Amino acid sequence: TVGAYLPAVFEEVLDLVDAVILTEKTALHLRARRNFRDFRGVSRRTGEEWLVTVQDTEAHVPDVHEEVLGVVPITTLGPHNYCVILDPVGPDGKNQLGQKRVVKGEKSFFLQPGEQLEQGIQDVYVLSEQQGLLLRALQPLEEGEDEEKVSHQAGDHWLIRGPLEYVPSAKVEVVEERQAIPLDENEGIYVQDVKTGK
Amino acid sequence: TVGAYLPAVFEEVLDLVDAVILTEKTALHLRARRNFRDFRGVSRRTGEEWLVTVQDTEAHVPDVHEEVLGVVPITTLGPHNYCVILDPVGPDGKNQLGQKRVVKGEKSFFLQPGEQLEQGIQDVYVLSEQQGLLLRALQPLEEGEDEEKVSHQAGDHWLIRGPLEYVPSAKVEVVEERQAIPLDENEGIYVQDVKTGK
C-alpha cells in the first residue's frame, strides 16, 4: 500500500522492499523458498526455480516466498550465429540432462535455470566453392537437405563443399577444413585413396 | 502555475524544475519511473523508455514519473552517406535484437533507445568504370536492381563494376576493391581461373 504505513503493536517492521524493473534484455531468476502461489497464479514447490520476464510484469517485487538468484541477461544471436544449449528444457519443464540443443539464426532467448551454453555464441560455417569441410558422424543420422535422404553410420566421414552456410549438428563433429588446390593444365598431384590404397 | 506560489502547511517545497527546450536537432530521452500517463496521453510501464521530439512540444518539463537519461542529438546523413542501425525498432516498438538495418540517402533521424550505429556515418561506394568491388554473400539474397533478378548463394563471390554508387547490404560483405589494368595492344597478363585452374 503506497503512502505512510503505520506498524502495528505485534508487527515488527524490518526493512523496505523495492521492485525489480524488467527490461526486454533482462529477466529475474527466482527459487521458491516453500510451497506457495505466485502473482500469475501457479503453484510452486520448494527449491524449484523459474524465470520472470517482461511478458509477466514490467516490475516485479521479490516475494518472501521467493529468492533472488540473479538477473539473467538475454542471449541474442545474429543471422550469422549459432549456439549449443547444455541440458535443454524439455516439454515437461525439466532439464534433459546430458543432451544438447542447437539453436541457429536470428533468435533471442533467456538461458532457463539449468541450461548453459556449450562454448558461447558461435558463428556458422559459410563456405565458398574453393572451401570444404571434412566432418565425421557420431551417431546414425538422417538429414534431408535436398529431396533425397542421405544416411551416415556412426563412423562415416564425408565432405561438405560448395557455396553454402553450414551449422554443425549435435551428432556431427567437424574434423578438418579443406581448400581446393589450383592446378593448371599439365599440372597435378599424387592422391592416395587410403580406403583402398590406390 | 506561473507567478508567486505559496506552499501549504503539509507540502514541503524541495526545488524548482525548469523545462527542456527541444530544438529540431535534439530530442529528450525519458525512462518511466512507474506506470502513468504522459502529456500526449499514452500509458507507460516501469523501466520503459521513449523519445520526445519537437513534434510533441517545443519545451517539455521533466515529470516526476519520468527520468532524464540525456539529450539525443540528431543523426543526419548526406546524399553520399549511409549507416547501419544495430537492433532496429520494429513495427511493435520493441528492438529487433541481433538484426541490423541499413539506412541510405539524405535522411535525418534520432537513434531510438536501444538502437546504435554499427560504425558511425559511412560514405557509399561510388565507382568508375576503371574500379570494381569484389564482395561475397553471407545469406541467400535476391536483388532486382535491373528488370531481371540475380540470386546468390551463401558463399557466392561476384564482382561489382561500372559507373555506379554502391551501398553494402546487410547480407553482403565487401572483400576487395579492384582496379582495371591498362594494357596496350600486344601486351597482356597471365590470369589463372582458380575455380578451374586454367
Swiss-Prot record, chains A, B:
It comes from the Eukaryota. Present in most normal tissues. Higher expression observed in epithelial cells with secretory and excretory functions, as well as in cells chronically exposed to xenobiotics, such as bronchial cells and cells lining the intestine. Overexpressed in many multidrug-resistant cancer cells. Induction: Up-regulated by IFNG/IFN-gamma. Phosphorylated on Tyr residues after EGF stimulation. Dephosphorylated by PTPN11. MVP repeats lie at residues 19-73, 74-124, 125-180. It is found in: Cytoplasm; Nucleus, Nuclear pore complex; Cytoplasm, Perinuclear region. MVP 3 mediates interaction with PTEN. MVP 4 mediates interaction with PARP4. The vault ribonucleoprotein particle is a huge (400 A x 670 A) cage structure of 12.9 MDa. It consists of a dimer of half-vaults, with each half-vault comprising 39 identical major vault protein (MVP) chains, PARP4 and one or more vault RNAs (vRNAs). Interacts with TEP1. Interacts with PTEN and activated MAPK1. The phosphorylated protein interacts with the SH2 domains of PTPN11 and SRC. Interacts with APEX1. May interact with ZNF540. Required for normal vault structure. Vaults are multi-subunit structures that may act as scaffolds for proteins involved in signal transduction. Vaults may also play a role in nucleo-cytoplasmic transport. Down-regulates IFNG-mediated STAT1 signaling and subsequent activation of JAK. Down-regulates SRC activity and signaling through MAP kinases. This is Major vault protein. It comes from Homo sapiens (Human). The gene is MVP.
